Design a binder for this molecule. Structure first.
Ligand SMILES: OC[C@@H]1O[C@H](O[C@@H]2[C@@H](O)[C@H](CO)O[C@@H]2O)[C@H](O)[C@H]1O
Length: 403
């Protein structure tokens, strides 16, 4: 940071991250604070509050020592000078090639590198094995295609049980919707953006299949749980956690809660990679938060001590693997989970297999995550409305390129 492994001298370091990653953030900070003189003062911020909080703090130069941001948000923040240039420190890491590359790439602008992985968050398919058995489905057969996803959701919908639906769609969360829907497109070998991130390529047969799948469930009695049309992103993981949804895309960072509920006598959870339109094709969204040292830090060496510590396979095993969470370190993924719950090892295989993507655009929030983004309207038109996929896609590109 200035020293190789930074300075551990009893400095209080501030770290900001977001509510969806709260369980993993707690584990990381608890472990750091138990093993260092330095202490991290953790703030966990609601997902939708980070843009305005970071923007406001940038203007009053009160950004924290360590800022973690959604990997889709980082390219913009890094372009605005939110982060201190740590190119030489990242480039000195012996194990740089083991670190989740999408998170480093998110923070790469003009040869400068600003970020490392903080918490990996990947999208997977989860299903309720109890509802599957009740519906006459094989409880171990996750969907291998978007068609099979529809069939399984429809059999759970046909149970006609109070508050039970086949699937659930985060209708008003552009962010949840990229996370949940992009992988089906990538699984098929299609793209959602051009290489620059300046154009949307969403008007494709795989995206149309995915939207038509959710349209079918929208037009099925009990197809999509109540709340799907209004879901802001604040509650989208709750209906499945509550045992009310047959099958849906889901964050790996929320699965440990499900595995725990199951150990405590709750319903049994299936996990599989998100499938393509094409039988047996799979992908994921290589998301989560990357972290950098803010432009406002007066403890760069102490912040670097945290950044350095977390990249090590030791810390990655302690804070991720030993807590049943997916690590940001591929060497940790390949070595530290040999006796983990098979569903954890299945989740890790969607990183190791290499079929996932991290979308990179300076305009990503404005085009995708933002409330009433062109992407949110595109999905809404296609699922609950009349879609014009060509027109809606061009609305996304007009934000991506303008400017
Ligand atoms: O934001 C894009 C990726 O999706 C996941 O985050 C989601 C939020 O956008 C949504 C609103 O909270 O909750 C989801 O967990 C990944 O963490 C992001 O990289």
């Amino acid at each position: 940071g200035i020293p190789a492994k930074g300075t551990d001298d009893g400095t209080e370091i501030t770290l900001w991250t977001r509510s969806p990653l709260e369980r993993q953030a707690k584990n990381v900070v608890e472990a750091y604070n138990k093993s260092h003189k330095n202490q991290v003062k953790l703030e966990i911020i609601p997902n939708d509050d980070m843009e305005g909080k970071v923007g406001g703090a940038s203007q009053t130069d009160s950004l924290p020592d360590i800022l973690a941001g959604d990997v889709v948000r980082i390219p913009y923040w890094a372009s605005e000078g939110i982060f201190t240039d740590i190119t030489k420190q990242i480039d000195g890491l012996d194990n740089k090639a083991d670190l989740q590359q999408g998170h480093i790439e998110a923070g790469t602008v003009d040869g400068a590198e600003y970020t490392l992985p903080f918490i990996t968050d990947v999208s997977v398919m989860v299903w309720n094995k109890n509802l599957y058995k009740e519906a006459g489905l094989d409880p171990e057969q996750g969907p291998k295609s978007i068609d099979q996803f529809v069939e399984q959701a429809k059999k759970v919908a046909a149970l006609n049980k109070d508050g039970v639906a086949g699937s659930y769609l985060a209708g008003q969360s552009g962010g949840a919707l990229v996370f949940d829907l992009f992988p089906s497109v990538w699984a098929d070998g299609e793209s959602v953006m051009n290489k620059d991130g300046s154009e949307a390529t969403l008007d494709n047969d795989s995206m149309k299949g995915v939207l038509d799948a959710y349209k079918e469930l929208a037009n099925t009695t009990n197809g999509l749980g109540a709340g799907s049309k209004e879901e802001t992103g604040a509650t989208w993981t709750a209906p499945f956690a509550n045992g009310k949804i047959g099958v849906m895309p889901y964050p790996n960072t929320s699965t440990t809660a499900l595995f725990d509920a199951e150990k405590d006598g709750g319903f049994e959870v299936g996990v599989a990679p998100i499938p393509g339109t094409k039988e047996g094709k799979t992908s994921t969204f290589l998301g989560g938060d990357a972290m950098g040292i803010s432009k406002d830090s007066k403890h760069v060496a102490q912040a670097w001590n945290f950044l350095y510590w977390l990249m090590q396979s030791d810390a990655q095993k302690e804070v991720f693997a030993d807590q049943g969470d997916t690590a940001s370190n591929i060497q940790t993924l390949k070595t530290a989970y040999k006796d983990a719950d098979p569903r954890i090892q299945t989740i890790n295989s969607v990183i190791i297999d290499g079929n996932g993507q991290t979308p990179k655009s300076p305009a990503f929030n404005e085009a995708f995550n933002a409330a009433g983004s062109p992407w949110q309207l595109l999905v809404q038109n296609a699922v609950w409305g009349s879609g014009d996929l060509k027109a809606d896609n061009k609305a996304v590109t007009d934000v991506l390129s303008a400017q």
